[PDB]
Amino acid sequence: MASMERFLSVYDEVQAFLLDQLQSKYEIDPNRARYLRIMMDTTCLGGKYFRGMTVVNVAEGFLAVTQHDEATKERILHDACVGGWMIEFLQAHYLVEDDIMDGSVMRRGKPCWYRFPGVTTQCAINDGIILKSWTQIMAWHYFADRPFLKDLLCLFQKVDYATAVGQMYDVTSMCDSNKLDPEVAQPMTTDFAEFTPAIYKRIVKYKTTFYTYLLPLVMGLFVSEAAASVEMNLVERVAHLIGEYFQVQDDVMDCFTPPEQLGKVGTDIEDAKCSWLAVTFLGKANAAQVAEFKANYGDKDPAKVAVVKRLYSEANLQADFAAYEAEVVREVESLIEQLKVKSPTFAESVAVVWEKTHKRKK
Amino acid sequence: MASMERFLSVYDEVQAFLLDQLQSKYEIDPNRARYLRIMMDTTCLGGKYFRGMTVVNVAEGFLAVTQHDEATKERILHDACVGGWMIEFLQAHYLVEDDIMDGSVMRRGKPCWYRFPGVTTQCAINDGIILKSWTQIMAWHYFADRPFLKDLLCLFQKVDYATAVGQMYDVTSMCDSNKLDPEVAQPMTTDFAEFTPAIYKRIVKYKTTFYTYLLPLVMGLFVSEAAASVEMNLVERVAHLIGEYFQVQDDVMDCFTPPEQLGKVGTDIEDAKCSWLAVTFLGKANAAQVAEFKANYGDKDPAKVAVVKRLYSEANLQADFAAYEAEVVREVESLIEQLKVKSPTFAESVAVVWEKTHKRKK
Ligand SMILES: CC/C=C/c1ccc[n+](CC(P(=O)(O)O)P(=O)(O)O)c1
Ligand SMILES: CC/C=C/c1ccc[n+](CC(P(=O)(O)O)P(=O)(O)O)c1
Ligand SMILES: C=C(C)CCOP(=O)(O)OP(=O)(O)O
Ligand SMILES: C=C(C)CCOP(=O)(O)OP(=O)(O)O
Ligand SMILES: [Mg+2]
Ligand SMILES: [Mg+2]
Ligand SMILES: [Mg+2]
Ligand SMILES: [Mg+2]
Ligand SMILES: [Mg+2]
Ligand SMILES: [Mg+2]
């Protein structure tokens, strides 16, 4: 796709800027420049670019309807690409650190970054820090003189914090809340009392929705100077709804989509995660199913994991998923109808966003 | 000390703000609030508060000589405390992640954060991310309306990036540059060709000087609206000089100061670090000393580490350290004399900063 290739051409610019600046201001040597170029490529490319391409689509929408000089159109488009890369680099940071946290093996069809033989956990941790740092370098360099600079930095910062809090909800979702204690080694829950749709919703709201949907949508609005032309409460409702759905699919694919197709190897069962599948299963199983789940969940043993997967297949969670999906379509369409009132162009971008999400197979 | 106790009283405010906001906007539950309060306390308290108390001292200096209403004096002092905590939280972030990277056992006289039984590497990584996030929450909340806000955020961001780059220089200092390669597992250097004072200086300049000295000094200037009243080139020279000296002491103590006194257990020998001791040693040893160093450095075996420590004692590095110290005193005094030209009060703060650094035994 041509537009994708163009968003990609701005990656090339941003990379050249970052690496040149390392040479000229940070005393980097050539082989460390090469290392960081490879690290940027592996952690920032290969994904679907949904978050990045959402910023661009939001801005393209407003450009079709807004009068500007050509030079202004070019500036806005370039701004939207740079903001999109800020979010892809933030994603790259999150993915580096999450793969370590989750004990993951594959990412975008390659070894996780920390599994590269020449990298290891020790360096990946810091490479993840550098990725985040680059988002700010990029923002201050490109947007220094833009009116939306303070708004963008302030939003970016809140969104990052929400995600970090969400990650803490996730990484501790298999422990009992009353037992959390830095001094005491953490046993896994035996009762699964906290595997509920409300608790699940809390995980997912913070860890994914803000950075995957709120952030790109609003950044599209910032670089378009169009924020005031939308109902923000609606922007937040729609971001959190499509965001949750997006995470539910991720959870389902972790279990049932082949690594060949997904580009990653699942760990949610093994990691004892509060996934949608585990929650929806406890939502419907009988006493004996519950017990066999309890004896097998959250263990790396392939035979225990297979037992969990059979239980999932037997419980017909495909039926629950259809019904959940049908409900989201209802609410997202409602939200999109409500957005046209003030912002038809934005509502349309949100439609496109939803369509792309709804259809994804990875 | 009373002033310390007062800087400390602003920690209490900042903590209450952060935890209340987690409850009211982030849907946190009480036991996770407790966990993060304990995490903030363990990772942010117990240090010497040098960086934090430098912001306060810089501002107190300008207040003694500048006319203000009392209300303004109180605002400036409070601003200096908050900026100081932003840097202590940044330090706490760096320390959490560094202890993981370095395989360290003790920090401020307690187990490293990731060694707490109830924490582990998996959670500490994210706790370190939250610490950094909190610096921005704190900045945007407290300084939203201040004229120095953009300057402070932009400086903070550049300083953080420099430190992250510096950390990459450190963590790869025991490998040959020409051999760095994400695809290939990294062998330790055999020739130690890159253990040179120039390369050492590069490590230390980036990993420590910006965040430990440039940042607090300039933040004191920002919250004092006094930046324009100094020669910034001199501020940078003095920060980088005292900063390097500060790191040299850290390196010496890692080897020779008892854990009981230091509050940490050294790993530089075991980690094959490019420390000042390793560099100054190669700076003077004879052929046979060089060989015995090479056969023992960068191995966790207590007998190999002891061999390295004997070689250090025999080479009389205490003599090199005295001579290095004497030279820094010369240059720092020169820089302080040069600061009085435009900024006597600032020169004095820098004198106090130097005196505290020069005298430290931990
Ligand atoms: C590091 C802060 C946030 C990370 C973050 C937030 C949201 C999602 N993810 C990563 C996914 P996956 O590993 O790609 O399947 P998850 O592990 O959640 O299933 C990672
Ligand atoms: C994580 C980014 C920077 C970390 C950073 C920078 C500078 C210094 N440190 C930490 C010290 P130590 O572990 O306290 O002795 P080092 O390990 O360098 O001897 C840590
Ligand atoms: C589920 C989440 C939030 C992490 C993976 O996100 P994506 O599936 O969008 O990953 P890439 O396209 O960037 O690979
Ligand atoms: C050497 C460096 C830069 C890390 C430790 O810094 P400090 O020795 O200042 O640690 P605390 O006082 O914060 O414990
Ligand atoms: Mg994961
Ligand atoms: Mg995860
Ligand atoms: Mg997943
Ligand atoms: Mg260390
Ligand atoms: Mg270190
Ligand atoms: Mg040290």
JSON list of C-alpha atoms and ligand atoms in Angstrom, two decimals, chain B residues 46-51 88 91 95 107-108 207-208 211-212 246-247 250 253 264 360 362, ligand 4:
[
{"chain": "B", "resi": 46, "resn": "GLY", "atom": "CA", "xyz": [17.35, 6.09, 51.99]},
{"chain": "B", "resi": 47, "resn": "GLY", "atom": "CA", "xyz": [19.82, 7.68, 49.63]},
{"chain": "B", "resi": 48, "resn": "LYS", "atom": "CA", "xyz": [21.90, 10.84, 50.43]},
{"chain": "B", "resi": 49, "resn": "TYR", "atom": "CA", "xyz": [19.35, 13.18, 48.64]},
{"chain": "B", "resi": 50, "resn": "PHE", "atom": "CA", "xyz": [22.32, 15.04, 47.14]},
{"chain": "B", "resi": 51, "resn": "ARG", "atom": "CA", "xyz": [20.65, 15.63, 43.76]},
{"chain": "B", "resi": 88, "resn": "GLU", "atom": "CA", "xyz": [15.17, 11.60, 43.13]},
{"chain": "B", "resi": 91, "resn": "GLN", "atom": "CA", "xyz": [17.34, 8.28, 40.22]},
{"chain": "B", "resi": 95, "resn": "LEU", "atom": "CA", "xyz": [18.64, 2.44, 40.31]},
{"chain": "B", "resi": 107, "resn": "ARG", "atom": "CA", "xyz": [20.97, -1.10, 47.64]},
{"chain": "B", "resi": 108, "resn": "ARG", "atom": "CA", "xyz": [20.85, 1.59, 50.43]},
{"chain": "B", "resi": 207, "resn": "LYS", "atom": "CA", "xyz": [25.60, 7.76, 32.34]},
{"chain": "B", "resi": 208, "resn": "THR", "atom": "CA", "xyz": [26.09, 10.00, 35.33]},
{"chain": "B", "resi": 211, "resn": "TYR", "atom": "CA", "xyz": [21.46, 13.60, 35.73]},
{"chain": "B", "resi": 212, "resn": "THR", "atom": "CA", "xyz": [23.57, 13.83, 38.86]},
{"chain": "B", "resi": 246, "resn": "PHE", "atom": "CA", "xyz": [31.70, 11.57, 41.61]},
{"chain": "B", "resi": 247, "resn": "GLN", "atom": "CA", "xyz": [31.70, 8.50, 39.38]},
{"chain": "B", "resi": 250, "resn": "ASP", "atom": "CA", "xyz": [31.72, 5.36, 43.15]},
{"chain": "B", "resi": 253, "resn": "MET", "atom": "CA", "xyz": [34.12, 2.42, 46.79]},
{"chain": "B", "resi": 264, "resn": "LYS", "atom": "CA", "xyz": [25.69, -1.79, 48.45]},
{"chain": "B", "resi": 360, "resn": "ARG", "atom": "CA", "xyz": [31.55, 11.74, 51.01]},
{"chain": "B", "resi": 362, "resn": "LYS", "atom": "CA", "xyz": [29.44, 6.79, 50.62]},
{"chain": "C", "resi": 4, "resn": "LIG", "atom": "C1", "xyz": [26.97, 6.51, 41.19]},
{"chain": "C", "resi": 4, "resn": "LIG", "atom": "C2", "xyz": [25.69, 6.71, 40.83]},
{"chain": "C", "resi": 4, "resn": "LIG", "atom": "C3", "xyz": [25.34, 7.79, 39.83]},
{"chain": "C", "resi": 4, "resn": "LIG", "atom": "C4", "xyz": [24.52, 5.91, 41.37]},
{"chain": "C", "resi": 4, "resn": "LIG", "atom": "C5", "xyz": [24.36, 6.02, 42.89]},
{"chain": "C", "resi": 4, "resn": "LIG", "atom": "O1", "xyz": [24.19, 7.39, 43.22]},
{"chain": "C", "resi": 4, "resn": "LIG", "atom": "P1", "xyz": [24.22, 7.84, 44.78]},
{"chain": "C", "resi": 4, "resn": "LIG", "atom": "O2", "xyz": [25.45, 7.25, 45.37]},
{"chain": "C", "resi": 4, "resn": "LIG", "atom": "O3", "xyz": [23.92, 9.33, 44.85]},
{"chain": "C", "resi": 4, "resn": "LIG", "atom": "O4", "xyz": [22.94, 7.06, 45.44]},
{"chain": "C", "resi": 4, "resn": "LIG", "atom": "P2", "xyz": [21.89, 7.57, 46.56]},
{"chain": "C", "resi": 4, "resn": "LIG", "atom": "O5", "xyz": [22.55, 8.54, 47.44]},
{"chain": "C", "resi": 4, "resn": "LIG", "atom": "O6", "xyz": [20.67, 8.08, 45.80]},
{"chain": "C", "resi": 4, "resn": "LIG", "atom": "O7", "xyz": [21.71, 6.27, 47.29]}
]
